[PDB]
Amino acid sequence: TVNWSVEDIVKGINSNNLESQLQATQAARKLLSREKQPPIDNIIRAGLIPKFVSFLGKTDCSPIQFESAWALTNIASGTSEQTKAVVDGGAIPAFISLLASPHAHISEQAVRALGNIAGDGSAFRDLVIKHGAIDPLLALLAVPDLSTLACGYLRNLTRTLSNLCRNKNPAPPLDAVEQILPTLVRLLHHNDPEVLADSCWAISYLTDGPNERIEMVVKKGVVPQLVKLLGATELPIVTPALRAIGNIVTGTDEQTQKVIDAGALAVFPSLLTNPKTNIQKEATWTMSNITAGRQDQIQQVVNHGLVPFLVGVLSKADFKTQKEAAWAITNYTSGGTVEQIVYLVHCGIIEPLMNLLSAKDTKIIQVILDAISNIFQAAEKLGETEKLSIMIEECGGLDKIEALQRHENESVYKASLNLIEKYF
Ligand SMILES: [Cl-]
Asked: What are the start and end residues of each ARM repeat?
């Protein structure tokens, strides 16, 4: 069945010989598994999807169920229009019936096919849910110990469940999320790196929304496990774990506190120096939504030794990361006590802050300028306003601020002039 033409496949599928149809379907499946440019569109144009879908129901002939399920899975893993062709052929209810197949390799294909369809987008996600996929999917995981399941099979179930958690506008139905979450919590404790990665992605999707979505997740007790995975060695795990934690700290101060209470801040020395740029970037963004919290939460950042790491990120990092660092400092200086803001200067924030004021980005400049203002405000409460003026002179900051009086932006000009006057 290697190297058939689409014309030969169609000839075999149009014979009314179940074994000839089986041969041709397998030929189609191998064509569609090809690495180089599989002829998905040619198979679709030939009108083969509805025949493949009808073969999903031939319970008398499990091999042709398998080959047609795999063929359709491959098509559904392509472009959105390709995925739509599969859905338009009636594949969704047929695949959901195949979840009850006694043949593990056949129910597995149906799991994968439904994951590919649900992962296309919110509409297909919700259509898969409306056809009732969740109950039969969760039943396949209703075992006392996940470790008795075949490794590849458990990974496909995890991947498919995370795709049912994925995408927004809208987010998934609340009742669907509640139904899935307990099984997701269990997968999040399973010791396979790929199951862990995909479960973390699932949690990152569910926490990417309003505070009530976050609370659903936080109430399940998963934050300690997320923090544990935040320290994993595998970057495919750390990345979604860090995303989930970062989402959770965009919520309320009480939700942020659960992350702190679980020990998250002790991982940030590594995260804020991580060789992977996006980890450093997302770790610094997370920090900024922690320094937007309460003064006792700022104080935890201090106690964990993280101000020097923020100074470090400001001084040298990818620019996008330095931008988040700037944000973290301004949030820190808006909400911090006077003692806390003084500590920040004593750690060296001023010189790296000044040096970023020469960046060809207008947003960061207004963020840095705001932070400088909030620091002076604290300097006033101590009268050491004079001494701060000097520091900013001694490192080239006054040169930088003077020129910003004359900037394309008006909010930039307003703030810079308002400072060169009020303090110099
Ligand atoms: Cl674990």
From this structure: 1-39, 40-79, 80-121, 128-172, 174-210, 211-250, 253-292, 295-337, 338-384, 385-424
